Amino acid sequence: AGAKDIRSKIASVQNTQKITKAMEMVAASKMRKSQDRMAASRPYAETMRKVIGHLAHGNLEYKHPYLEDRDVKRVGYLVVSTDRGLAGGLNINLFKKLLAEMKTWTDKGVQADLAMIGSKGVSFFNSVGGNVVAQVTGMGDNPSLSELIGPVKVMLQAYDEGRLDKLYIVSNKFINTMSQVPTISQLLPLPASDDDDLKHKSWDYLYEPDPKALLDTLLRRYVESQVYQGVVENLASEQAARMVAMKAATDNGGSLIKELQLVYNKARQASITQELTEIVSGAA
């Protein structure tokens, strides 16, 4: 009813466009805040990687399950995902890349299972029916490491006891503001390339109580730090993907309003033209 409702419909789209125009700026600010948090986490992990390098590849060379090579009979992943919608295809892209590798090990007859961060991943993989052993959800902004100790400890327990022989983290990477990429990278066993030194392990550390407890706890903390950092970097990628999705929603809404207006002006003009034909015809 162009005289009546097309008029309101335009108002509803105009209001919707004004809102999404604002959400693009919210997302672009949260992306900045997450980007600072992302950078702070890198120096703790990079320091800890230096310590395990010094003890692992030091002149006396130690042995540990999380560090040593093992052949594969079961493979494990843990996966990060959003608790909120919008953000384009970000989750689905990562999930289909995960299914591609999960199918690759399945073709090798290698059993797989998943640990899960975020309720989108919970829902998709229950819909697939892939084995999910652990879950955490509802972090929002400001996620905390304390939550994530749960998920890693049961994956750690699985890996050490043989139930798992490889473990990977599945997450998106914040290349920059404009581009983000879904990636999978290994946690257990420790994949990192060897390194070499003289001063380190020549001016060797006094150990307390002993160098074995300090290798065990240190590895436990390192892989924990690796998945905290992946969680933060995926969160930065969520805000970036939402910022872009709100740009499209704002331009799409602006494209619809103008087509609804050309349609309305036709109805506005036609009804004037009809009713004057009636008034003049009725003045017989």
Partner 1 sequence: FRDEGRDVLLFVDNIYRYTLAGTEVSALLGRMPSAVGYQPTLAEEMGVLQERITSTKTGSITSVQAVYVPADDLTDPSPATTFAHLDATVVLSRQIASLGIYPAVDPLDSTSRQLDPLVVGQEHYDTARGVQSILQRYQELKDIIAILGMDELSEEDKLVVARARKIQRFLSQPFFVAEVFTGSPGKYVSLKDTIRGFKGIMEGEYDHLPEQAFYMVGSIEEAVEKAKKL
Partner 2 sequence: IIYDDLSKQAVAYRQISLLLRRPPGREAFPGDVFYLHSRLLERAARVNAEYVEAFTKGEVKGKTGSLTALPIIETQAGDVSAFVP
Partner 3 sequence: TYHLDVVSAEQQMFSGLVEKIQVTGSEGELGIYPGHAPLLTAIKPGMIRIVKQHGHEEFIYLSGGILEVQPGNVTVLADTAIRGQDLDEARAMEAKRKAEE
Residues in contact with 181: Cβ distance below 8 Å, sequence separation at least 6, in sequence order: 172, 173, 175
By CB under 8 A, residue 235 contacts partner 3: no
Q: Give CA–CA dist 52/67, Å, rounded.
A: 10
Which residues in the 67-96 window bind partner 1 by CB under 8 A? none
Q: Give CA–CA dist 247/137, Å, rounded.
A: 28
Q: Hey, what are 174's tokens?
A: 């914040």
By CB under 8 A, residue 205 contacts partner 3: yes
Give the 3-state secondary structure of residue 276.
Answer: helix
200-224 burial, b if ≥16 CB within 10 A, otherwise e? beeeeeeeeeeeeeebeeebeebbb
Q: Which is nearer to partner 3, 215 or 245 (CB)?
A: 215
Closest listed residue to residue 20, CA positions, set 257, 244, 259: 244
Binder of partner 3 out of 15, 29, 47, 104 (CB under 8 A): 47
Of the candidate spans 20-28, 110-118, 143-151, 225-233, the one that interacts with partner 1 by CB under 8 A turns out to be 20-28
Give yes or no for a cis peptide into 209 (omega within 30° of 0).
yes
Q: From the CB of 243, what's the least distance to partner 1, in Å?
A: 8
Question: Can you say whether the dihedral through the CA atoms of 4, 6, 11, 15 is positive or negative?
Answer: positive
The amino acid present at 17, given as its one-letter code, is Q
Q: Which is nearer to partner 2, 4 or 63 (CB)?
A: 4
Q: From the CB of 208, what's the least distance to partner 1, in Å?
A: 46
Q: Hey, what are 230's tokens?
A: 């992946």
Q: Hey, what are 71's tokens?
A: 């052949």
- Radius of gyration (Cα) for the chain, nearest Å? 28
- Interaction partner, residue 103 (partner 2, partner 1, partner 3, none; CB < 5-8 Å by kind): none
Binder of partner 1 out of 3, 11, 25, 154 (CB under 8 A): 25
Q: Which is nearer to partner 2, 68 or 275 (CB)?
A: 275
Binder of partner 3 out of 21, 74, 221, 247 (CB under 8 A): 221
Q: Which is nearer to partner 3, 47 or 277 (CB)?
A: 47
By CB under 8 A, residue 159 contacts partner 3: no
Binding mask 236-275 for partner 2 (x = CB under 8 A): --------------------------------x---x--x
Q: Give CA–CA dist 186/170, Å, rounded.
A: 9
Q: From the CB of 27, what's the least distance to partner 2, in Å?
A: 34
> Can you tell me which residue has the tokens 């609804």?
260
Residues that bind partner 1 (CB under 8 A): 24-25, 28, 177, 243, 262, 265-266, 268-269, 272-273, 276, 280
Binding residues for partner 3, per CB under 8 A?
A: 40-41, 43-45, 47-48, 51, 116, 126, 132-136, 144-146, 149-151, 153-154, 157, 203-209, 211, 213-214, 217-218, 220-221, 224-225, 228-229
